[PDB]
C-alpha cells in the first residue's frame, strides 16, 4: 500500500480510521494515528491487506498511536486532497487564527482555522487534555487523520468533535464547530519518530 495521510485503514477488521502521517523510527516504517483507533497489537489493514500493527498508543489522557509497518509499505510525504496531494514539508506549529486543513476518509479534505489551544475534551472513556481546536468539519471515520497547513506544516491528528446525528459537524456553521486534534510535536518526541518530508 502507498502510505498517504488521510486514507482509510481498518483495525482488527472492525473500526475504521484515517492515516495521519508517514514517519520512520530507525529502519522501521510507521504512520501516526489517533490513540483511540486501536490497542497495542491491533492489526491495521489497507484495502483488505495487513500493513502492520499498533506499536504503542495513549488514550484517554492524550489521543496518540503509531502503527509499525511491514517493509513492503511505501511511505510518502503526502496528504490526500481529493485526487491531488499536499506535500509534507515539516512540523512548524501554527498559532491561533492560522488557517488549516484536515484530510480523512469520511469527509475528505476540509479547511478552517485554529480557534483554540490546550482544550480538554471530556470523552466518555475519560478526558483528553491539551487538544488544539479547529473549525474545519469532520465525521466518524475521520479520526487519526492529518491536520496540515496548505504550506505543508503537519499540525496533528484528528481526535474528536461535536458530531450531530448525521455523523459529522459539516451541517452546522463553522462558528459552532469544535474539531479537536492532538498536536504532532509531542507524538514525534514521545516515540522518537521522524516525519517523512518532501
Amino acid at each position: 500500500a502507498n502510505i498517504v495521510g488521510g486514507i482509510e485503514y481498518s483495525i482488527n477488521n472492525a473500526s475504521l480510521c484515517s492515516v495521519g502521517f508517514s514517519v520512520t523510527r530507525g529502519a522501521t516504517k510507521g504512520f501516526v494515528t489517533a490513540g483511540h483507533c486501536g490497542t497495542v497489537n491491533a492489526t491495521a489493514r489497507i484495502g483488505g491487506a495487513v500493513v502492520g500493527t499498533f506499536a504503542a498508543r495513549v488514550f484517554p489522557g492524550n489521543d496518540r498511536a503509531w502503527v509499525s509497518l511491514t517493509s513492503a509499505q511505501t511511505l510518502l510525504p503526502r496528504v490526500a486532497n481529493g485526487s491531488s496531494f499536499v506535500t509534507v514539508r515539516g512540523s512548524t506549529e501554527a498559532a491561533v487564527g492560522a488557517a488549516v486543513c484536515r484530510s480523512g476518509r469520511t469527509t475528505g479534505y476540509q479547511c478552517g482555522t485554529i480557534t483554540a489551544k490546550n482544550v480538554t475534551a471530556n470523552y466518555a472513556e475519560g478526558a483528553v487534555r491539551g487538544l488544539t481546536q479547529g473549525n474545519a468539519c469532520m465525521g466518524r471515520g475521520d479520526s487519526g487523520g492529518s491536520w496540515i497547513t496548505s504550506a505543508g506544516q503537519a499540525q496533528g491528528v484528528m481526535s474528536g468533535g461535536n458530531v450531530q446525528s448525521n455523523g459529522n459537524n459539516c451541517g452546522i456553521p463553522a462558528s459552532q464547530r469544535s474539531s479537536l486534534f492532538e498536536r504532532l510535536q509531542p507524538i514525534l518526541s514521545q516515540y522518537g519518530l521522524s516525519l517523512v518530508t518532501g
Partner: peptide, 4 residues
C-alpha cells in the same frame, strides 16, 4: 465532543 466524542472521539472517533
Amino acid at each position: 465532543a466524542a472521539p472517533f
